[PDB]
Design a protein around this ligand. Structure first.
Ligand SMILES: COc1ccc2c(c1)cc(CNS(=O)(=O)c1cc3ccccc3o1)n2CC(=O)O
Lengths: 275, 287
């Protein structure tokens, strides 16, 4: 007996078993199931993921809201209802981990670099939960922001390596008017910090344009912009190929930066074409 | 979809081919059964095939893939029995419609990268001196389940620790598959069927009956408690020539962080010359 699903309405499920049943039932009636995993506290970046999912013809949008211990509820639900989303999946920690921590995903060596330097088991947690969510919902496509680019690349590796049957859709970073990448962390910045934070996106965009003049020009331009900001402690600034291997001589790449402003760690990244 | 001819053995090497065929069969109302194997098929494997066949409306997929990732040294890997002609002939005789025989390059085109890390059971018993062994098994089994997407997957109780680890895999990753354990098939004297039995010379084959004798002796001794069951098994192993015991352990049926109660599993590993044999049996304690 399938749990109740009311079409055109926000249906909220906490039991993984229930959302599994509704998703399968929906797949069998011609819906294309789109998954948008979130950690709640939704903002415009999250709504951009929702909107991208919503525009696939015959889509039903599943938004998961799960605070992963290994990696405003009513506010959030009203936004989704406002976006015309039909399923929120809101499971408990116990429901996700009924046997506690046991079998897990071990990321490849990319997980040890960049963000995996300050947080070396962060990515295992993320990939473990994403794999679980994929298996519960069995979506046709799953949506992630390019904001967390290294995470996104690790998810693409998960999907490839485990032969998962889902398309991974990366959605361009939603930005404030001055270019700052949207993030929940942005609200912790004092005005001096928030004005200085603009150096991350400014550096990366300056780098993307300088790149007609080569990889070195691109990197030196980004470094100059970051060097013009006070109180911006750069953790890394790295040019890599699109899959985060070493940057090819010329061609397509990604430039990633991370910096601490007071106690707030900020990240950004951008597409780079070399020459 | 590639060609699929019902009532005939259809052999696919490309993951995409078997995946497409499987999905199309499921969408037609057939139930897809998977029996993951490392080839060198013997009567133990045919029991799994038979169990799968008797699921009504089943189409049966047997995979044959000697998985490098669950082997320690390349030495082990090169020595593994490969008899693919006997394998396919046995599958034909059993009425299996799909054999899935992937290449190493197709399964691991990027080498080792994202893997499954099993829970702490993978470090005990067989996993003790082989710390990456069960990671290798769970990784390839996860991949096979995702490629084939079966309704049910069949594993022998012979490799009992493996079966338990697969059940954990399936629970913890929320996989939508039923795991079916099939009772150990035995030779007339009680010897558990195994691809390793071929390495026993005549003396060794004679001595090897001691494992199953010891376990069945234990299961009946167990009315007198755990110590009696254990000491019965040990006496029988000790009375056998050229049988070096590696472990003999009585655990809970889940083999887990839980004390043995009424129902347990008695597990043995022993060396005959260079050949390492395993067996295990259900044990009820104080009956
Ligand atoms: C499209 O424009 C943007 C811009 C910034 C964005 C996003 C989109 C999305 C995010 C954060 N990712 S998430 O909360 O949806 C998430 C949920 C989840 C669940 C399980 C595992 C990993 C998971 O990751 N951010 C940045 C941020 O909020 O810091």
């Amino acid at each position: 007996a399938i749990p109740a699903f009311h079409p055109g309405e926000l249906n909220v499920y906490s039991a993984p078993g229930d959302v599994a049943d509704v998703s399968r039932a929906l797949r069998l009636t011609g819906r294309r199931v789109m998954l948008v995993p979130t950690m709640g506290a939704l903002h415009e970046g999250h709504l951009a993921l929702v909107r991208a999912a919503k525009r696939v013809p015959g889509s039903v949008v599943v938004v998961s809201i799960f605070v992963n211990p290994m990696q405003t509820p009513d506010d959030d639900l009203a936004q989704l209802r406002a976006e015309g989303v039909e399923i929120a999946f809101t499971p408990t920690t116990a429901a996700m981990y009924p046997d506690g921590l046991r079998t897990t995903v071990q990321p490849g060596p990319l997980a040890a670099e960049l963000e995996g330097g300050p947080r070396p088991t962060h990515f295992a947690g993320v990939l473990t939960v994403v794999l679980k969510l994929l298996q519960i919902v069995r979506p046709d496509r799953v949506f992630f922001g390019e904001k967390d680019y290294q995470q996104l690349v690790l998810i693409r590796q998960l999907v490839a390596d485990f032969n998962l049957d889902v398309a991974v859709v990366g959605v361009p970073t939603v930005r404030e008017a001055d270019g700052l990448a949207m993030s929940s962390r942005n609200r912790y910045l004092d005005p001096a910090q928030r004005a200085a934070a603009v150096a991350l996106s400014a550096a990366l965009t300056a780098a993307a344009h300088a790149a007609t003049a080569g990889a070195q020009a691109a990197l030196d331009a980004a470094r100059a912009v970051l060097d013009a900001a006070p109180g911006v402690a750069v953790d890394y600034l790295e040019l890599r190929d699109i899959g985060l291997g070493p940057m090819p001589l010329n061609g397509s790449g990604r430039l990633l930066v991370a910096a601490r402003l007071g106690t707030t760690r900020l990240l950004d990244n951008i597409a780079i074409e070399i020459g």
